[PDB]
Amino acid sequence: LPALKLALEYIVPCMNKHGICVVDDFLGKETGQQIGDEVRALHDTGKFTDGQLVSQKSDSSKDIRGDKITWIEGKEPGCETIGLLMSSMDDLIRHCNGKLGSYKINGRTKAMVACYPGNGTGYVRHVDNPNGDGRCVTCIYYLNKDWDAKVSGGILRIFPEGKAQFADIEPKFDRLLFFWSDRRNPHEVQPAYATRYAITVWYFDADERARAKVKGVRV
């Protein structure tokens, strides 16, 4: 699918109606697998953090850690298919622009690659941007070949604002997800019992980000 046709016929309508949009088979199997390989090489070569401190015990070799992260710009050696993913997200957003709510998207973060290590940890209920920091759209790409949540857990559960209620989204290979980053979409990651990778970029609305700057920037 040309990025523009996906954007106009699918992303924009779904985002405006539901605030959440799932695109399956985004990049296809060859590119998805190449991204998988890049992320696994990052993991195998020690490029992730040790993971979010989940249980701090006053004895510390028994601390439990959860999601590990690394920030990727997309031009690093061995990360160029991740770079390519990021470009493809950006092209999708560029084709939506002016049509997602009333936002005008003018920038994004680096990619945050996350690895839930498969030790029963997940991620607590949260809103990505609860305090007006500029981020308007969360974009997540999942990496996980043959993921079965009934065995491996790791479902993303989102609670669209005032609804009875939730949507359960499997972290499926080659699935791309968008959702509004603000309090409209509280969400959580259920415990994962197998290694679970995802790559997230957040897009900034120009007006929100400009006044967030207000609330060394000193001349």
Ligand X SMILES: O=C(O)CNC(=O)c1nc(Cl)c2ccccc2c1O
199 part of the interface to ligand X, by CB under 6 A: no
182 part of the interface to Fe ion, by CB under 5 A: no
Tokens of 101: 């709510």
Part in contact with ligand X (CB under 6 A); list of ranges 18-26, 87-95, 103-111, 120-128: 120-128
Tokens of 83: 């770079």
189 part of the interface to ligand X, by CB under 6 A: yes
8 Å CB contact between 43 and 115: yes
8 Å CB contact between 29 and 117: no
- Closest CB to Fe ion among 70 and 81? 70
- Closest CB to ligand X among 8 and 69? 69
Part in contact with Fe ion (CB under 5 A); list of ranges 37-45, 74-82, 122-130, 146-154: 122-130
Tokens of 166: 């939730």
Taking the complex as a whole, the smallest distance from the CB of residue 57 to ligand X amounts, in Å, to 22
CA torsion through residues 212, 215, 217, 219, sign: positive
* Distance separating alpha carbons of residues 169 and 9, to the nearest angstrom: 21
171 part of the interface to ligand X, by CB under 6 A: yes
Residue 1: which residues within 8 A CB-CB, separation 6 or more? none
Closest to 180 in 3D by CA, of 199, 154, 161, 156: 161
Is 95 annotated for ligand binding?
Answer: no
- Amino acid at site 208: E
Taking the complex as a whole, the smallest distance from the CB of residue 218 to ligand X amounts, in Å, to 29
Does residue 118 come out as left (phi exceeding 0), alpha (psi in the -120 to 50 range) or beta?
Answer: left
- Closest CB to Fe ion among 128 and 205? 128
156 part of the interface to ligand X, by CB under 6 A: yes
205 part of the interface to Fe ion, by CB under 5 A: no
Of ligand X, Fe ion, none, which one sits near residue 192, judging by CB under 5 to 8 A according to partner kind?
A: none
Can you tell me which of 38, 67, 128, 208 binds Fe ion, judged by CB under 5 A?
A: 128
Is 128 annotated for ligand binding?
Answer: yes
Of ligand X, Fe ion, none, which one sits near residue 67, judging by CB under 5 to 8 A according to partner kind?
A: ligand X
Tokens of 148: 């079965």
8 Å CB contact between 116 and 192: yes
Q: Which residues bind ligand X (CB under 6 A)?
A: 67, 69, 114, 123, 126, 128, 140, 156, 171, 187, 189, 198
Task: State the binding site for Fe cation.
Answer: 126, 128, 187
Task: State the binding site.
Answer: 126, 128, 187, 196
